[PDB]
Symmetry: D3
Subunit: 253 residues, 6 copies
C-alpha cells in the first residue's frame, strides 16, 4: 500500500500480502553508501513501521553489494565541523535505535560488501543472512576514521568486544563460514540470501504481533540492565505477552 511504500527516494519498498516489507537500499551506483538523506529515510520508515502494521522487514542492498558504508563523498564535500558530524552521527543512531528497539523483526539479506557504516546498518537488524559472496570489514580506520552508527556497540554484542576492536584497529576482513561462526551472521546460505531471508520473514510474520514486538525490543533493553533488575522487567514482559487471548487460542489449537 502507498501508505507504507511511498515517500522514499533512496529506498525501494515492496510490501507483501502477509505484511513482510522488503526495504531495499537503492543507490546501487554508489554501492548503497549512506548519505544524510538516506539515513533520514531510514529514521522515518523505522519510526512508523510498527504503527503502520508492517509485520517483518527484509532489508537488502540493490545490486551486488549490501552497503559500502557512510557516504564519504558527501562527507568530504561537506567539510564538516566536529559538531556538524556529531549531529550527523546522532541521526544514524536514531535510525538504528529505531530498528533495534522498534519491535518490528528485521532480517538482513546480505551480499558482497558489508563494510564500515554498512556493517553498522547490518548490525541494527535482528537477523542476518549472508551468502558465499558476503564479506565484513571496518576499513575506514586505515584512513583515520572511527566507525559510527553504533557498530562499536552492536558488533561487540555480535562477535565480542575484542574481536570488534581487532576489526576496527586492523581492518581485518571476515567472510564465508568463518564470518558466520564468528557471530557476524546467524545464517549462511549456498544459495540466495534474499530467498532464505524471505523464508525466515514469512515464518516470523505468521507469529503473533505482540510476541514478535517483545522479542524485538525487550531483549535489547534487558541486556542494558543488571541481570537482577532485568529479571523483574522480564516478568512484566512475560505477564503481558503470555496472557494475551491470541496466545491462549494457540495453546488450545
Amino acid at each position: 500500500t502507498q501508505d507504507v511504500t511511498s515517500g522514499y527516494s533512496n529506498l525501494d519498498l515492496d510490501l507483501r500480502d502477509n505484511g513482510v516489507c522488503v526495504v531495499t537500499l537503492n543507490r546501487p551506483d554508489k554501492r548503497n553508501a549512506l548519505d544524510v538523506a538516506t539515513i533520514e529515510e531510514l529514521v522515518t520508515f523505522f519510526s512508523t513501521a510498527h504503527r503502520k502494521g508492517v509485520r517483518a522487514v527484509v532489508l537488502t542492498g540493490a545490486g551486488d553489494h549490501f552497503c559500502a558504508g557512510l557516504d564519504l563523498v558527501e562527507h568530504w564535500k561537506a567539510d564538516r565541523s566536529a559538531d556538524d558530524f556529531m549531529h550527523v552521527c546522532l541521526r544514524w543512531h536514531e535510525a538504528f535505535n529505531k530498528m533495534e528497539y522498534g519491535g518490528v523483526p528485521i532480517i538482513a539479506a546480505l551480499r558482497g560488501a558489508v563494510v564500515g557504516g554498512g556493517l553498522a546498518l547490518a548490525s541494527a537488524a535482528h537477523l542476518r543472512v549472508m551468502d558465499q559472496s558476503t564479506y565484513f570489514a571496518l576499513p575506514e580506520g586505515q584512513r583515520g576514521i572511527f566507525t559510527g552508527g553504533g557498530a562499536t556497540i552492536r558488533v561487540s554484542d555480535m562477535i565480542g568486544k575484542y574481536r570488534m576492536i581487532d576489526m576496527i584497529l586492523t581492518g581485518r576482513v571476515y567472510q564465508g563460514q568463518e564470518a558466520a561462526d564468528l557471530g557476524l551472521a546467524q545464517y549462511i546460505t549456498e544459495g540466495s540470501s534474499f530467498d532464505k531471508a524471505m523464508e525466515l520473514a514469512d515464518k516470523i510474520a505468521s507469529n503473533l504481533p505482540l510476541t514478535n514486538f517483545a522479542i524485538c525490543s525487550a531483549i535489547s533493553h534487558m541486556q542494558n540492565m543488571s541481570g537482577l533488575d532485568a529479571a523483574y522487567a522480564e516478568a512484566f514482559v512475560g505477564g503481558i505477552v503470555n496472557t494475551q487471548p491470541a496466545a491462549r487460542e494457540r495453546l488450545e489449537a
Copy 2:
C-alpha cells in the same frame, strides 16, 4: 541426610558423602515440565543449600529428557491474568537467581530436550554437560509465548544476544558439537553426561568452600557492573578469598 534431602515432592535428592548433592527433576511422566509447585521447591532448595553445607549440585532430569519447559497444562487450566502470570515469573526468577548467585556450584547433566523454560533452568546452572541426545530450543515462540525464567538474560550471556534473539524468534534448534561450540554447554560427552557431571562435581567439591562460593556468586555480580567499578569489588573479593588460612595451607602444601 534428611535435613537436606527431605521436603520435596517434585525433586529427588541424593546427597553424596563428599557434599555433592544430586538434584533430579522428578516428573518424568510430564517430561519434567516445571509447574509452580516445582519452582517453589527449587526456590527452597537453592535458598538453603549453601547454609546446609551442600558443596556442589549435579542437576539432572529424570528420564530421557532434561526438562520440557514451563508446565503449559497448568498454565492453560489456570487461565492466568497478566498480573497472575507476572507473579509466577517472579517465582521462576527467585529460584534461578538463587541458583546463579547463591554460591553453590551447579553442574547440569543434560539429556534429550532442554527446551523453553527447560533451557532457562539449564542456563541457571554454572556448568552444563550435554550428551549425544541433547538438543536446545525455545519453541514456545511459535505458539505466541515469550520465554521466561531469565533465558533472555542468561542465554544471551551464553551464546550472544543475537543468537538468543534468533532462537526465540525462529524456534531454531541446536544440538551436538554445534550446540557446544555455540556456547550452550561447556562440556559435550560421547558417553554419560551424568557421569561426566559427577566427575566435574567431585573435583569442584574438593576445592575450598569460600573460593567456590566467590566464583559462583561474585563473577555474575561483577558482570552486571561497569568494568571500572567491578575492578574495585574484585579487589575486595580477592582480599577475602586469597588470605584465608585454608588457602595459605594449600600454597604451602
Copy 3:
C-alpha cells in the same frame, strides 16, 4: 630514547623508530611471575606511554613462557592480611585499567604458559597473538585462590561469562586452534607470535594517533554503558575523530 626506556628493573624496553615499543616482562628465571614491584612498573609505563608518544606496544614475556601469574612466593612470604591483599589487587587493576583504557594499542605476543595472573595481563592487551606452544589456564583455583587483575571481567568479555567461570572453577586448559576459536586470542600463528605481533603493531603505528586513541579507550568505555547512552557518547567520539585535519587529508589522499 632513555626518556621512554629507562626506569624499569623488571621490564625490558625497546623503542623502535616508528614509535612501536616492545615491552618485555623480564624475570625469565621466575617465568615472569608478577610481584608488586613489576606491577608498579607496569602502572608507571602505561600511565605515561600515551603522553610520551608511544604509538603501539608489543607486550611479551622473556623466555619460553609469557607469564606464570601472580608471584606466589612473594605472596606466601608476605603473609598478607585481607586488606593488604585487597590493596595489592587495586595496584594490579590500576596497571591493567591503564592498559585497557589508556589509548595506546597493545598487542601481546604470547608463547607457552599464559596462566592465572598471566592470563589477566594478556587480557588487558587489546590484541593477542598466540603460537603453537601457547596455552591458557586459571590453575590457582585448585589451590583455593581466586584470580585477580580483572580476569573475571576481561576473560568474560573474551570468551563468555560461562566459559570464564568454567575455567576458574575447573582449571580447564585451552590451547591451539581451540583456544583461538574460543576467543582467547584473535591471532594464532604457525610461526613466531612476536613477528606477527610486530607486523600488526607496525601497521597500527602507521595509523592516526587520535583514531587509535579512540579505538583503544572509547570502545571499552561504551561497553560499560547501556547501548542507548553509549550511542550518544559515540556520536561525540566520531565527531572529534572523523573531522580531524589529518583524517581529511587521508580521504583526499
Copy 4:
C-alpha cells in the same frame, strides 16, 4: 513560522522572533488531559524542534491548570488490554524522552494542578517555574493505577526516590515554597510563572545553540552511566563544545575585561 507552528490541533504553538516557541496544551475544558492524539502531537513537535531551529520552549497549559494527566475518560472507555496500554505508554515515553534528550531547552510555566501524567510531563522539561496556585501530586493510587510517562524516573531524580515513592504510595500533595524546596520546581514566583518562564527562555535563547544542545542532552545521558565512564564521555562533549569557533569571541571578552 508556518513550517514550525502548522498542522497541530491539541497544541497551540507560537514561535517568537528570537526562536523561543510557546507550546500550550489547549484542552482547558478537560484540564489539558493527555489523550493519545495529544501525545502524538508532542512526539511530532519534540522530534523535530531541534532541526527546525527552535532555540527554547516554554511549555504551558491553557486555563487554570497545567495538566491533569492521562485522559482517564478516553482510557476508561477504550477498555484497553494490558498490551494496548503498554503501547500507549511507549508513545508517552517517545514524546517525553525526546523532550529530555532532544537538546532543546524546555521551561515549563506551571499553574494549578500538575498531577499524575501532568507531573510526568512537567518533569520531562529541563526547568520548571511554579506560581502560588501550583500544586503537585501523583494521585494514581487513588484511581487504583500506576503512574507513567517516566514519572518514577524523573520525579525520583527531582525529589529523591523515597519522596517519589511517598507521593505515589500516599497521594501526598506538595505546593508553595515547600514544593520548590523539595525539588519539584527550580523557580517559584509571586507573579506570573509564564512571564518568569519567558524571561528564562529569552536568556537561554541568547546563548550558543551547540552549548545549549549539550547541556540539554548530555547531562541526562551521563547520569545513566557509571561516573567513571561518564567522565570519558564528558571529555568528548567538552572537546567539541569548548573549541567551537563561536565561543572564542566570548572567551576573548574575558581575556580583556569587557566580560
Copy 5:
C-alpha cells in the same frame, strides 16, 4: 492469623484485620541490636509476607530506641574472620533486599536512636515516620568499622551521596525537623510516630494489592537502570497495573463525579 505471626522469637508480630502487620523488634534491653538470629527472622518474614497476604507493615522497635544496629557484643565475641562476617552481611542484605523489593509497603515508626545498622534497617522500609525523640547517625567509624545492610546505597538515595559520606566519615548526628528536611524521614510528628505510621498503613492497605506491589518493587528496580531502559520497563508495569479489572470501578468513579 497463626500462619503469619507464629514461630518467631526476636520479633513480635501483630496482624490487624485489615491486613496491616505490626512487626516489632523485641530486644529492648539490648536496644534491639540486630544479631544473626534476628536477621534470619527478618529474612523469613519478608520473604513470605507478600504471598501470605500482608497488605502493609508497620516496623517498630520495643522500648525507647528503634534499633542500635549490629549487635556489637555478639560480633566482638564471635571474633569473626573476614569471610565469616562477609557472610553475615549477605544475610542482612537478603532481609533488607526482600523488604525493599518485596512489594509489601513498609512504614517504619521511629523513636530514639536509629543508628548504624539501625539506620540501614530503617532505610530498607519505603516510608519512615520520626518523632521528636528520634535521631540518626552512622557512628560506625567511631567503632573503627564500616556500615552495612546497604546503608551506603539506601541512605545515599535518601539524603545524597555526599551527605551519606559525611555521616559515616564524621559521625555527624541529625535529628528533628533538620533530619526530616535532609531526607532521613518523609514524616515527622509532634506525637506518636507509631500512631502516624498506623494511619499511613491503614490508608495504604485500603488501596489495590497489585498497585501497591508495583509501587513497592518496580520503582527501586527502575532506579538501577539507565532512564532510557527504565522507561520501557515502566510501560509494561503500567500496562499490567493500569488495566487490571479492579481499577475500573475507581476509573468509573472519576468518569462521573463520585470521586
Copy 6:
C-alpha cells in the same frame, strides 16, 4: 616530610604531624585558575597520597577565592582543536577521579568564588566547608562553553540533576545558607572555613586508615552500580574492614562502657 611536599610549584603543600596535608592552590593573582601544569600536579599528588601515608587532605585556595576554574587565558591562547581539549579534559578527570576514588579523605575549605572548573574541583573532595564569602556558579554558558572536571556528574550527585542543569543552563548563583541547604557544601561557618576544615580533618585522621580508605572509595563505586549488585560488594568491603585487628580494641570499648 620532604618525600611528600617537595617538587611542586603551583601547589603549596604542608604536611602536619598527624598526617593531615594542607594542599593550597597557589596562583592567587590568577584566582587560582587551573592550567594544565596545575592539573598535572594535582594528578601527581592524588595518585600517590594514599601510598605516601597522607591521612587526610585540606584543600584550599590562596587568596580570597577558592578557584576560578579553567584557566581561560591559557585556553583561549592555545586555540585548541577539539581533540587537544578533549585530552586536556581527560587529565582533569585523572586528577579528580584520583581525589574521589583514591581513598584519602579530602575536605575543601572554601572562600569566595567556587566557579566553573573551580566547583568541579570542590566537588571532587568528599567534604566541603563554606564560609560567608563563598558563592557557587557554573558560568560556563556565559563563555559559550560546557563545564568539565566531572561537574555534570558530581554536582548532580550533590544537588540533583535538575538543579545542576539549572545552574549551567542559566548561570544561577548560590551562596550562604541557601547553598549549604541545596547540597553544595555539608558545612557552613560564620568564621574561618579553613579552621573548621582542619577540625574535621584532625578528627578524621584520628580514625583507622583502612576504614577511612573504604569510606572514601567504596561508596562512590557502589553508587555506580545497581543496588542489588552493590549490596554484594558492600558485604565484602564490610567483611574486610569490620574484622580488622585494629578495630577490636574499639569494639571492646563498647563491650564495657569506656566508649
